[PDB]
């Protein structure tokens, strides 16, 4: 490892700003208390082989070593500042990007930053029980790496709050530790982040699908005229890519194991696959349906004056804004969205500014579909017919125009009776979830993997797959 240096590694000259540094250090012990309370369960004395960034360059990014998570060096890292960067969209296109928050947008920027910050500890809270049933040291270590990274994402947003929003900033930093996933009176802001993540199959789906909402929200904010936010999100995207990998390869390894048992037993009978302790592909498809549809609601209403305002004011851009071939102002542009009118799902064009949530949702759908295309290479290579698919965008939605109807995965509007009698085929049943639960059992033997999942293609940081990625320090409970 590179030589220790700073208590809070950073590339923002934190030490030069005494007032700001003091505010973060006053908040730190509160963060550490939250981490001990709501962080990975019973993990206080584990030594975990973790990656820590200590500077933004490739070498400093990849500082691997054993560390207790309580002692993780959470830091603050902005993509390098560019000389003479201009705003790329909206009313202010062509002007210098902002280094400070414009008073007129203070409350909106604050809202955007806090809502993003809120999802980071929510994922840790949702996932805190999982290590008790980790299917391998490798997977246990990946879970912990995701967790400390989401912890750092909370630091990333709290830094912006303290640095740019004064006393309100600090009050937002405190409340971010007071809310709690699933709590009755102070729940987390967004509904999908108040859901349970009850097993490892849900965990891999969540990091494959819901961390991908993180990618598309962060990619939109990485375009912001408010440059400290833009540069914060650009760096965060490198960590988000790791989360997406954990999710995609996690499910890939599960599909691999189930295809192996299908080949061995020579059957696709789910009763027989389950007798052999694997997760049948159809059940995997239900979990895909579930996490996909719940995540889709995170993009918000298809039509929205708020999203239009964020774009025009230069706060939040479209995904890969600069690659888009239009005027980047959209006053006379359209975008095609669906609509529901009685017994018909139809299409219409609306003003582009009013449908930016739907555009972002569509970008995310395209990305998810690419990952699903990659999973499908597995049955294909085994010569099986099974293919995973994404359901219609209107299936199982609680936000927006499809909220008041039922749509089947194959895109029909369906009756209440048909939803009630058939959705057991489309979303995990209580019984499906009990079966998956029945398979969850810790496996901490080095190089060994629980029977429902295959080994990964390679280890971490060139270590053998049977490396002791976690040391439990059992003598010191
Ligand atoms: Cl404000
Ligand atoms: Fe995150
Ligand atoms: Fe993430
Ligand atoms: O993330």
């Amino acid at each position: 490892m590179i030589n220790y240096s700073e208590r809070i590694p950073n590339n923002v000259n934190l030490n030069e700003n005494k007032t700001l540094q003091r505010a973060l250090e006053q908040w730190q012990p509160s963060f550490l208390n939250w981490w001990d309370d709501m962080g990975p369960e019973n993990s206080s004395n584990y030594d975990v082989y973790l990656r820590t960034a200590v500077s933004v360059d490739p070498k400093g990014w990849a500082d691997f070593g054993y560390v207790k998570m309580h002692d993780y060096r959470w830091g603050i890292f902005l993509a390098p500042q560019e000389g003479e960067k201009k705003i790329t969209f909206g009313e202010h296109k062509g002007q210098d990007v902002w280094q400070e928050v414009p008073g007129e947008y203070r409350s909106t920027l604050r809202r955007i930053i806090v809502t993003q910050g809120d999802t980071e500890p929510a994922s840790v809270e949702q996932q805190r029980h999982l290590g008790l049933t980790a299917p391998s040291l490798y997977d246990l270590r990946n879970l912990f790496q995701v967790n400390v990274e989401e912890g750092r994402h909370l630091w990333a947003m709290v830094y912006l709050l303290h640095a740019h929003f004064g006393r309100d900033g600090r009050e937002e930093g405190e409340a971010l530790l007071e809310r709690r996933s699933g709590d009755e009176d102070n729940p987390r802001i967004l509904t999908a982040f108040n859901e349970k993540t009850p097993d490892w199959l849900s965990f891999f789906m969540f990091t494959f699908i819901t961390d991908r909402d993180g990618k598309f929200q962060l990619a939109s904010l990485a375009e912001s005229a408010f440059d400290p936010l833009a540069r914060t999100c650009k760096f965060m995207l490198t960590e988000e890519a790791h989360h997406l990998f954990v999710g995609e390869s996690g499910i890939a390894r599960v599909i691999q194991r189930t295809c192996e048992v299908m080949k061995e037993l020579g059957t696709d009978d789910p009763a027989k696959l389950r007798a052999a302790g694997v997760i049948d592909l159809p059940t995997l498809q239900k979990y895909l349906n579930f996490h996909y549809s719940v995540t889709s609601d995170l993009y918000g209403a298809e039509i929205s004056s708020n999203a239009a305002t964020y774009y025009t004011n230069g706060l939040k851009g479209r995904f890969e804004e600069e690659k888009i071939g239009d005027d980047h102002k959209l006053q006379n542009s359209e975008y095609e969205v669906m609509d529901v009118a009685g017994d018909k799902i139809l299409t219409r064009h609306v003003p582009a500014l009013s449908a930016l949530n739907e555009r972002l949702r569509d970008d995310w759908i395209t990305d998810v579909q690419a990952g699903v295309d990659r999973w499908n290479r597995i049955p294909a290579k085994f010569g099986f017919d099974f293919r995973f698919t994404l359901p219609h965008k209107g299936f199982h939605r609680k936000i927006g125009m499809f909220a008041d109807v039922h749509v089947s995965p194959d895109g029909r509007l369906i009756s209440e009776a048909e939803w009630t009698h058939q959705h057991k085929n489309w979303l995990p049943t209580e019984s499906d979830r009990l079966y998956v639960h029945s398979l969850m059992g810790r496996c901490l033997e080095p190089g060994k993997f629980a029977n429902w999942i295959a080994a990964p293609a390679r280890g971490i940081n060139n270590q053998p797959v049977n490396f002791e990625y976690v040391r439990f320090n059992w003598s010191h409970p």
Side-chain angles (χ1 to χ4, degrees), residues 21-173:
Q21 177 183 66
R22 287 191 169 203
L24 283 171
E25 302 193 311
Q26 181 186 358
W27 173 82
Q28 182 165 17
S30 272
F31 172 90
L32 295 173
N33 290 346
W34 164 83
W35 178 265
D36 294 339
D37 291 345
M38 298 303 311
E41 189 176 349
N42 299 345
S43 77
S44 68
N45 203 213
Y46 300 173
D47 288 335
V48 187
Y49 192 71
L50 289 171
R51 181 193 63 76
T52 304
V54 292
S55 55
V56 299
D57 52 271
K59 175 168 170 57
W61 197 80
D63 200 43
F64 282 92
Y66 286 100
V67 72
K68 292 190 211 306
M69 287 180 290
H70 184 92
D71 301 305
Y72 189 78
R73 288 166 293 162
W74 283 290
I76 296 159
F77 294 110
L78 272 66
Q81 187 175 185
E82 302 175 35
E84 304 267 326
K85 205 186 172 63
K86 306 299 189 195
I87 300 177
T88 61
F89 64 93
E91 279 182 347
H92 299 121
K93 183 185 190 290
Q95 304 197 283
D96 291 327
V97 297
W98 313 322
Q99 301 304 334
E100 307 288 353
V101 178
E104 65 180 312
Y105 308 139
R106 188 184 193 269
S107 68
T108 302
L109 254 351
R110 176 155 61 118
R111 181 160 89 209
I112 287 168
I113 288 174
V114 171
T115 297
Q116 178 61 45
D118 189 73
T119 74
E120 319 289 358
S123 74
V124 176
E125 297 164 345
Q126 286 173 306
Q127 293 163 14
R128 68 179 310 260
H129 309 294
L130 290 168
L132 272 45
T133 52
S136 70
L137 294 184
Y138 168 90
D139 291 292
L140 179 67
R141 185 230 79 94
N142 281 345
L143 163 70
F144 289 168
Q145 183 74 52
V146 168
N147 298 152
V148 297
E149 278 166 1
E150 303 292 18
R152 200 203 68 74
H153 286 182
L154 176 56
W155 281 82
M157 295 296 122
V158 167
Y159 166 79
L160 295 178
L161 299 164
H162 284 248
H164 299 280
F165 298 82
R167 181 149 151 86
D168 294 331
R170 303 192 294 277
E171 180 186 357
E172 294 286 359

Side-chain angles (χ1 to χ4, degrees), residues 87-93 95 98 104-105 225 304-318 321 328-331 352-354 356:
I87 300 177
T88 61
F89 64 93
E91 279 182 347
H92 299 121
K93 183 185 190 290
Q95 304 197 283
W98 313 322
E104 65 180 312
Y105 308 139
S304 170
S305 293
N306 250 346
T309 291
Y310 297 163
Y311 185 89
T312 295
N313 294 347
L315 310 186
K316 180 180 183 186
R318 303 173 285 174
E321 175 73 23
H328 306 281
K329 288 173 179 282
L330 314 186
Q331 295 289 299
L353 284 170
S354 79
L356 295 166

